[PDB]
């Protein structure tokens, strides 16, 4: 393919062109020829210069990270590999450890070999360690950010940004990213805030090329719409979209097809745990493994299960997954037991699972691609939102198709249904990746920590923010647009009349009433009696596409409740159809015309066709009827109608005469008549306006039109500019400070209090509410299991259908805590913060208080799974977060000498951390 390089340089910097660089030695060698994009980036690293690599996942970004690790270890320096989430870290830890040996891991869940030369850690742990000011950072020469484009995430994005800003200038960075369009900005931002060069290596290289296919629901096969050469097949696409417009078990057929044509392994994506298991259920009748394979994976499986006690081994979640696995069918989502999630990944890599039903998260797992990828849908819940999966997302996921060694191509199949709009579908498969736009936002833990530390400030963080940086770049571009508009406006501000204003007003009023008339006469109650064969009708479908005058062939009651206008289909002959429109896709009673169907424009040839429309598409009904052919489908008959239309238009150059709605159609109710009279009043009033006759007309009119648009663009542009100002964020800051002052976390002089200091060290739950809780004493008299239960209200982030009827020993602490939250949400409102006070209080989810409480009192796993609808894996996830939170509290208690609190929190840890909840990971 092609490799693009750029570099962002500090002022007055002595730059030697990267391509001239010759490394004296290779800090790491590879058993394959480097790709130039790799070679280049590695030179950057050899030169001690930061670099953003921007490439697709199969392209080999890992080669670059590895080089930085080796070079650091070689120079006796330390290096940090930051992953987005803990699951990837574990995977990456396992991969790096085997390679370089001198490797450790620090996540929310665990710490291994913390003194190693190469540390794998999550962005969150990095963040803490920085604010914690750990000495580790001093020794660090390189920080690698894997998947840095996650910085654009609305809720988690801030952490990336925050930690980057926080890093020492001496440090150098390897940023790994998807192919983003605005790499330059990122580099430049790095360049400014860290006063060092930052390279950019970009490439669209794909080792294995993708073919994109559409599968219309209930269809008979798949349609190639984008081929290996990346060529868009318009014609096939049109066919596909029409096939669904004319029209859960399809999946079974699709997998069977894939099997039959040897396209496995396939990842079948869905966007809900539930959809995943359902789909797997349909497959199980099939069997994709040889007896040898069955034996092999059963051994692997048992070996994983071996650490677990028999009592856990007997969970039906464990016992009844094995029969799926043996058939070569996998499942993967955050709801499974972790141990199952892991071994399934493993069994997938070893090629024992030919079909894998998975949620989105599997797509960013380490080294787990397939030959084929199937989207069962492209709609995902953002909890409380309905996303058409972004182009960028479609790409990244579809990028998991095509296995470098073994496949000529990757196969991507997008299942579509009636809900699908063509533009959206077209948009995905021609996926253009999204910008990396900052999602920075102020946070209390952030602010508080900045205040705590001598040399830095909230104001600093804002100033160095990618967010603010993206502003100071964009604003001048916009002020340049505004001025260009303003100049055109002030220059176009040559209105000769205010009579024009009157003209406009009248015209539009008339236009509006005529539409009212239209609604009436085209209503089936009026129109159907006048739509006899041959009737001349003026056509305008969706009010956009004007086919001019056509002729009715027939009409009929629409058969699937629609609106009245939409309840009848009329077939009409038009002679203005664009010559290349796919008229072969038209179906006789589907008013949703195929993509491509359009009128011809100024310099195009026309053809005659029979299209189906609803009464909405009728603009006028004429008082003429063509003599229609007996068989409109017989050769030349359409063109014959067309000739007659030409003759009619030629015999009526100034418009085809229409049915008088009153004198002909007999529509004479009172309201319709005064409607016609209003139209009548305005037409004469119009004639009185001097302009209507004159020659100026369009000159004076178009002028009038232009200023207002221009005025609008300006008004709109002035706003975007207004909301791109640093002061916004600065307001947010002062407000949030009020809060911290009002709550007693910091002085009015913005000096941190004892309460601020403890809140600093809390990252797992809401640091305000938790802090308040602690200092008011709510934990003082609780037994540990109560504290556990109360604390679950911060670790639990999931949504569920069942909820417990709390006895008092849980209901009271819950109540007491909601009161404080309330007091807090008060103060939040008090400081003009965009917070809905009830939603806050309720954001602390309580539905697992009894689960946690009883787990802490010795209930078995089985029992607590029965006490809630939350998934087993989710349960363990929640416990693990709960542990992390608790450890953070143990820490703060320690550092304020509250020996009683500390012991309590420690006791909680001992209650939680046992049995299946304490099962270790297959990777560690």
């Amino acid at each position: 393919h092609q490799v693009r390089h750029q570099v962002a340089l500090p002022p007055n910097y002595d730059y030697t062109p990267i391509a001239e660089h010759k490394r004296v030695n290779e800090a790491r060698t590879y058993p394959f020829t480097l790709d130039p994009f790799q070679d280049t980036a590695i030179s950057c690293i050899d030169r001690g210069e930061s670099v953003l690599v921007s490439a697709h996942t199969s392209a080999g970004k890992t080669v670059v990270a590895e080089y930085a690790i080796a070079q650091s270890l070689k120079n006796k320096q330390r290096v940090i590999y930051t992953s987005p989430i803990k699951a990837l870290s574990n995977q990456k830890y396992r991969e790096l450890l085997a390679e370089f040996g001198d490797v450790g891991l620090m996540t929310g869940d665990i710490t291994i070999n913390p003194d190693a030369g190469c540390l794998v850690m999550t962005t969150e742990i990095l963040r803490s360690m920085l604010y914690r000011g750990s000495e580790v950072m001093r020794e660090v020469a390189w920080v690698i950010f894997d998947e840095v484009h996650y910085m654009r995430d609305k809720e988690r994005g801030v952490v990336w940004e925050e930690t980057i800003i926080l890093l020492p200038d001496k440090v150098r960075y390897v940023f790994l990213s998807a192919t983003i369009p605005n790499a330059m900005e990122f580099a430049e931002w790095i360049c400014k805030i860290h006063s060092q060069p930052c390279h950019i290596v970009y490439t669209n290289f794909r080792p294995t090329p993708l073919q994109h296919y559409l599968f219309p629901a209930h269809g008979d096969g798949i349609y190639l719409v984008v081929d290996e050469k990346s060529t868009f097949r318009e014609e096939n696409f049109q066919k596909a979209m029409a096939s669904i417009s004319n029209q859960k078990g399809d999946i079974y057929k699709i997998v069977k097809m894939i099997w039959k044509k040897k396209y496995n392994p396939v990842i079948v994506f869905s966007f809900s745990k539930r959809d995943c298991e359902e789909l797997a259920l349909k497959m199980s009748k099939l069997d994709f493994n040889s007896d040898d394979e069955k034996e092999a994976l059963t051994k692997i499986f048992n070996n994983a299960i071996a650490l677990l006690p028999e009592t856990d081994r007997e969970l039906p979640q464990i016992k009844h997954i094995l029969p799926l696995l043996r058939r070569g069918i996998g499942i993967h989502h955050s709801g499974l037991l972790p141990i199952l999630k892991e071994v399934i990944e493993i069994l997938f890599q070893e090629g024992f699972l030919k079909v894998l039903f998975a949620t989105e998260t599997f797509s960013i797992g380490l080294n787990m691609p397939a030959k084929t990828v199937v989207f069962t849908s492209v709609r995902k819940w953002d909890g409380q939102q309905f996303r058409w999966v972004s182009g960028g997302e479609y790409i990244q996921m579809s990028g998991r198709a095509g296995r470098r060694g073994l496949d000529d191509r990757g196969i991507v199949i997008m299942m579509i249904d009636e809900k699908m709009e063509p533009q959206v579908a077209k948009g995905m498969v021609k996926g253009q990746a999204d910008r990396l736009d900052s999602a920075f936002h102020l946070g209390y833990n952030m602010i508080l920590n900045l205040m705590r530390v001598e040399g830095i400030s909230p104001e600093f963080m804002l100033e160095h923010s990618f967010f603010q940086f993206q502003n100071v770049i964009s604003v001048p571009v916009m002020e340049k647009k505004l001025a260009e508009l303003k100049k055109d406006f002030d220059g176009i501000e040559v209105e000769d009349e205010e009579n024009v204003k009157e003209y406009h007003e009248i015209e539009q009023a008339i236009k509006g009433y005529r539409e009212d008339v239209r609604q009436v006469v085209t209503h089936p109650a009026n129109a159907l009696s006048f739509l006899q064969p041959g009737r001349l009708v003026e056509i305008s479908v969706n009010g956009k596409d004007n086919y001019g005058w056509g002729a009715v062939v027939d009409f009929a009651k629409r058969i699937n409740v629609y609106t009245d206008h939409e309840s009848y289909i009329v077939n009409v002959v038009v002679n203005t159809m664009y010559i290349d429109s796919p008229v072969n896709l038209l179906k006789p009673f589907n008013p949703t015309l195929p993509e491509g169907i359009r009128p011809a424009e100024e310099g195009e040839k026309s053809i005659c066709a029979v299209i189906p429309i609803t009464l909405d598409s009728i603009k006028s009904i004429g008082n003429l009827r063509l003599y229609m052919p007996k068989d409109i489908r017989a050769s030349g008959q359409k063109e014959t109608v067309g000739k007659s239309l030409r003759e009619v238009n030629r015999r009526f150059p100034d418009g085809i005469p229409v049915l008088d709605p009153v004198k002909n159609m007999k529509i004479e109710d009172e309201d319709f008549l005064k409607l016609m009279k209003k139209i009548d009043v305005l037409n004469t009033k119009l004639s009185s306006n001097p302009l209507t006759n004159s020659m100026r007309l369009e000159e004076l009119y178009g002028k009038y039109s232009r200023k207002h648009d221009l005025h609008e663009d300006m008004k709109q542009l002035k706003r975007k500019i207004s909301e791109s100002q640093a002061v916004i964020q600065l307001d947010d800051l002062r407000r949030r400070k009020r809060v911290l002052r009002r709550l007693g976390f910091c002085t009015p002089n913005d000096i941190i209090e004892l309460k601020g200091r403890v809140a600093c060290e809390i990252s797992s739950g809401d640091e305000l509410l938790l802090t308040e809780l602690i200092f008011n004493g709510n934990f003082n008299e609780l037994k540990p299991e109560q504290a556990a239960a109360l604390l679950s209200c911060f670790a639990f982030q999931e949504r569920c259908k069942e909820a417990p009827r709390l006895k008092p020993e849980l209901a009271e602490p819950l109540k007491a805590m909601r009161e404080i939250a309330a007091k807090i949400a008060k103060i939040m409102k008090d400081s003009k913060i965009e917070v809905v006070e009830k939603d806050y209080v309720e954001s602390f989810r309580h539905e697992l208080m009894e689960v946690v409480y009883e787990w802490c009192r010795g209930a078995t796993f089985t029992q607590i799974c029965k006490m809630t609808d939350v998934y087993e894996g989710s349960l363990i996830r929640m416990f693990k977060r709960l542990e992390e939170l608790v450890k953070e509290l143990v820490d703060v208690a320690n550092t304020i000498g509250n020996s009683s609190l500390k012991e309590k929190m420690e006791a909680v840890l001992k209650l939680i951390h046992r049995d299946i909840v304490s099962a270790g990971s297959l990777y560690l």
């Binding site: 008979d220 097809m257 539930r274 089985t862 029992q863």
Partner: protein, 56 residues
């Protein structure tokens, strides 16, 4: 004593299904299949190039 209370007060209806309590649940793992396996893999079974590629 009296096996009832007098109560003429209202209680806000629960937003969600009432979950089972510790008292209602035993440690028999096979029971999960019915109680929690609905529509899940461990639920109980009924037992108790070319432009176009066809499914064919």
């Amino acid at each position: 004593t009296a096996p009832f209370v007098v109560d003429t007060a209202p209680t806000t209806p629960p937003d969600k299904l009432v979950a089972p309590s510790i008292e209602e649940v035993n440690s028999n793992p096979n029971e999960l299949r019915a109680l929690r396996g609905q529509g899940r893999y461990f639920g109980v079974s009924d037992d108790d190039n070319d432009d176009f590629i066809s499914l064919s």
